[PDB]
Amino acid sequence: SVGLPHMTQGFWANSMLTEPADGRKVVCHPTAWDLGHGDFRIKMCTKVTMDNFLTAHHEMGHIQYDMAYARQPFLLRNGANEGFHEAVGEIMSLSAATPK
Amino acid sequence: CVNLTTRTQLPPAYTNSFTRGVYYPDKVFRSSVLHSTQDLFLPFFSNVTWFHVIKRFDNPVLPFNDGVYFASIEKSNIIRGWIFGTTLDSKTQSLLIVNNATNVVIKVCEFQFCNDPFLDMESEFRVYSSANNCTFEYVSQPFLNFKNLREFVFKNIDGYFKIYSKHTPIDLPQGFSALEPLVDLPIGINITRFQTLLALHRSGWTAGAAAYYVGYLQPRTFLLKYNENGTITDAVDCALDPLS
Amino acid sequence: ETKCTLKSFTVEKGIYQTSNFRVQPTESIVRFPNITNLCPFDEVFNATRFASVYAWNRKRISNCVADYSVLYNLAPFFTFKCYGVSPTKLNDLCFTNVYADSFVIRGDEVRQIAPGQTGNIADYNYKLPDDFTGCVIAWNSNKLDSKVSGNYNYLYRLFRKSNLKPFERDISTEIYQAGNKPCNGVAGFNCYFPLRSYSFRPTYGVGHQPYRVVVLSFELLHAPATVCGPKKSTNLVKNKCVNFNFNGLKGTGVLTESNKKFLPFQQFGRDIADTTDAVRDPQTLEILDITPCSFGGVSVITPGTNTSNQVAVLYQGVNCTEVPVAIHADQLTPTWRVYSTGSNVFQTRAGCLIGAEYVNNSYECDIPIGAGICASYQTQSIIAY
Amino acid sequence: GNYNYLYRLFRKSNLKPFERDISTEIYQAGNKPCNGVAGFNCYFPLRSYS
Ligand SMILES: *[C@@H]1O[C@H](CO)[C@@H](O[C@@H]2O[C@H](CO)[C@@H](O)[C@H](O)[C@H]2NC(C)=O)[C@H](O)[C@H]1NC(C)=O
Ligand SMILES: *[C@@H]1O[C@H](CO)[C@@H](O)[C@H](O)[C@H]1NC(C)=O
Ligand SMILES: *[C@@H]1O[C@H](CO)[C@@H](O)[C@H](O)[C@H]1NC(C)=O
Ligand SMILES: *[C@@H]1O[C@H](CO)[C@@H](O)[C@H](O)[C@H]1NC(C)=O
Ligand SMILES: *[C@@H]1O[C@H](CO)[C@@H](O)[C@H](O)[C@H]1NC(C)=O
Ligand SMILES: *[C@@H]1O[C@H](CO)[C@@H](O)[C@H](O)[C@H]1NC(C)=O
Ligand SMILES: *[C@@H]1O[C@H](CO)[C@@H](O)[C@H](O)[C@H]1NC(C)=O
Ligand SMILES: *[C@@H]1O[C@H](CO)[C@@H](O)[C@H](O)[C@H]1NC(C)=O
Ligand SMILES: *[C@@H]1O[C@H](CO)[C@@H](O)[C@H](O)[C@H]1NC(C)=O
Ligand SMILES: [Zn+2]
């Protein structure tokens, strides 16, 4: 709704959004993996709480940031400084948390 | 390819074509009418070159012209096919018509023709070493005490190669007969010379008697007669004598 | 009409030739022979093993009938980019031959197959001319040409000394030297192989999924063209004055069963005046006779306009059963249909006479109709005798 | 590149002399209606010189 591209179809297929039932174990840590070759995934357990809502938005900011530099020769696909990565997800979380 | 130096050469003979070589100019039906046409015909009472093979052996590279009338009195099909082209080698593009045991095959390519191409039931051929680059191929039903008279007319105009044909159970006989159209090919190539193809049988070799005749077409005016069933039954050559 | 023909407001006693009569056909027949010469398609499209982009597969297509109407049953592909002609029902052209090239590329290099484009494929693998006529069709093959461990079969060129000429293909495996020292045939420093792999995996995005690309190029040479396209046909109607087209023979008239026995190779037929009067249907091999639709002349029999305004009409050389009946417009007479059933239709060897009563008496001739028949104004009415 | 110039490519019939058509409707290529959205068998009639 702000002017960002829509997510890929495979993003919703390769991403874990709910805790597995049985047979698999997850380290229980929210991560946003950039697998490579245009592959992006979110690994986290999502619960019914605004804490999980804020964490999901924070990881979604990282997801938007990571795909935003997919057009670089594998050496510029980072940030200019180490602070840009965690700054992107903070503003989105703050804006969505406003009472309006 | 193989070379057999056993030829018995004698000069080609000359004989008379009386009224042979009339074909249907087009595909229009006309009934009980007299129609005047101007086209490439073999003039009446003309000189035609005569070759015979029995050991008689001769396969000259005769020159092509506005068109060719080909005749063969034969039995058991010693003569099989033809080659058309300009240089008869791999430098230029040549057309080849072969009469298989069961199908006629037409191919235009850059063949490498030997000095003596011929066939030798026998299923061996000595014509070309390889086909370089082919742009047309066609296959269909075969074209073919002396008993068999085969008459052919070959024309090459506006990129189309036309073959008219007639077969008769029988030098050249008296009478009239019109050659119905047989084949039209959009080859779109240039032809300047041609050379016949015989099939030998090794038993050295023994070959049966056969004769073939070559004549050349020229532009002329004819008056043709169509009977009730659209058949050409008679013709008049307007430039032969005062009476015509 | 008589007044306009005579350029006067008064007419004297007599018979005058005014205009003509026609039939004005309806509907069209477009019969063409059976469409039985299958294009070599379904083998370069529905194939099972394509080739590399640097070794793209080439096929030559000739002496067939193009069938550009089955591609709508193909994948949901969005790439049908056509240059030189428009793809909107414009496949009726005839070409001497068609060259079809096929290869497989990545999802992001589909735009590189176009004239005036630079990149890796366009400069080292596949170069297209500026005057390229034809078009490119690319469809996704994610579910068939991808491997979980990686499809390392397809390859491409990465390093070349110079660009590629249009319609050029090189399969040399020479080592590309970037430095200033001889390679000696070993891959050491400043020397790398020019060929690399794609390693397709199904988990990749749309930009890395394999895409199968086929390029059609049309040639128009001085040799006769033999690749044309589907020739459609209507159904034929007989005993009705219609327009018709038979293998390019155009005309108008009535088609009927014919007793003529054509020779097997003959297509048309002509009469002694050299006009087409018979035809052969290309699909079903029988003979149809052709007859022109009815036509003739019209003469107006009138007494003086000083006497009356009644007239009679003679249709010349016309049987009275083919007299105009009309619906709205099938007759070149300017729609002055005269009553037929109740207006004393009479038949003479000169034609059909309408508007006059035939009597059994005999008088001296007043207005000559012909063949011993005259007309007069007596009693008051117009009579023929 | 100037894209301000457009011209028509797809039309049902040839145009009569001295007629001006400014119809922006999506040309019906396929039998199924385009419903006012371009795509497969649905192309914008006007394209640019560029
Ligand atoms: C053109 O195709 C039609 C297809 O129907 C052919 O018509 C059929 O011909 C067969 C003979 O093989 C008959 O048994 C059928 O009854 C015919 N059906 C119809 C509807 O006509 C027709 O013969 C073909 N023409 C040519 C020249 O091949
Ligand atoms: C054999 O070769 C000679 C010359 O090498 C040539 O004149 C001749 O035509 C060839 N063929 C036969 C059958 O002699
Ligand atoms: C045919 O050729 C012969 C030579 O054998 C010649 O004498 C004659 O004049 C030519 N023409 C005719 C009509 O015989
Ligand atoms: C037709 O020609 C081929 C070679 O082109 C040959 O193998 C085949 O035997 C021939 N057909 C017959 C019936 O002999
Ligand atoms: C094969 O011959 C045709 C006709 O001459 C020609 O157009 C074509 O370019 C030739 N093929 C090659 C590869 O040169
Ligand atoms: C055949 O005719 C064409 C057309 O003029 C010409 O280009 C070609 O050179 C001719 N063939 C030869 C062998 O010269
Ligand atoms: C012509 O056709 C008729 C059939 O009407 C047939 O009787 C006759 O034999 C055919 N040939 C000739 C020469 O009349
Ligand atoms: C490929 O197969 C499909 C299967 O339905 C068919 O519809 C399509 O026409 C085929 N492709 C070609 C080029 O014939
Ligand atoms: C006119 O048509 C009728 C009806 O078929 C027919 O009986 C008659 O012979 C034809 N000719 C004349 C002069 O009446
Ligand atoms: Zn974060």
Residue numbers in the entry:
A (entry chain D): 317 to 416
B (entry chain B): 15 to 68, 77 to 142, 153 to 176, 185 to 210, 215 to 247, 257 to 297
C (entry chain A): 298 to 676, 690 to 695
D (entry chain C): 447 to 496
What does the paper say about this structure?
In addition, neither the prototype RBD nor Delta RBD interacts with mACE2, but Omicron BA. RBD binds to mACE2 (14.23 ± 6.22 nM) with a higher binding affinity than that of hACE2 (18.2 ± 1.33 nM). Consistent with the flow cytometry and SPR assays, mouse, rat and least horseshoe bat ACE2s were found to initiate the entry of Omicron BA.1 pseudovirus, but not prototype pseudovirus. The S protein of Omicron BA.1 was found to comprise 30 AA substitutions (15 on the RBD), six AA deletions and three AA insertions. From the complex structure, only one RBD was observed in the open conformation binding to mACE2, while the other two RBDs in the S protein were closed. Numerous mutations on the surface of the S protein were observed, which may enable Omicron BA.1 to escape immune surveillance obtained from natural infection or vaccination. The mouse is also regarded as a potential host of the Omicron variant, and it has been hypothesized that the Omicron variant is a mouse-adapted virus. Notably, two key mouse-adapted mutations, Q493R and Q498R, had not been previously reported in any other SARS-CoV-2 variant before the discovery of Omicron, suggesting that mice are potentially the original host of Omicron.
The Omicron variant of SARS-CoV-2 carries multiple unusual mutations, particularly in the receptor-binding domain (RBD) of the spike (S) protein. There are 15 amino acid (AA) substitutions in the receptor binding domain (RBD) of the S protein, nine of which are located at the binding interface of the SARS-CoV-2 RBD and human ACE2 (hACE2) receptor, namely K417N, G446S, S477N, E484A, Q493R, G496S, Q498R, N501Y, and Y505H. Receptor binding is the key step for SARS-CoV-2 infection. Omicron BA.1 was found to display a broader host range than the prototype, whereas the Delta variant showed no alteration.
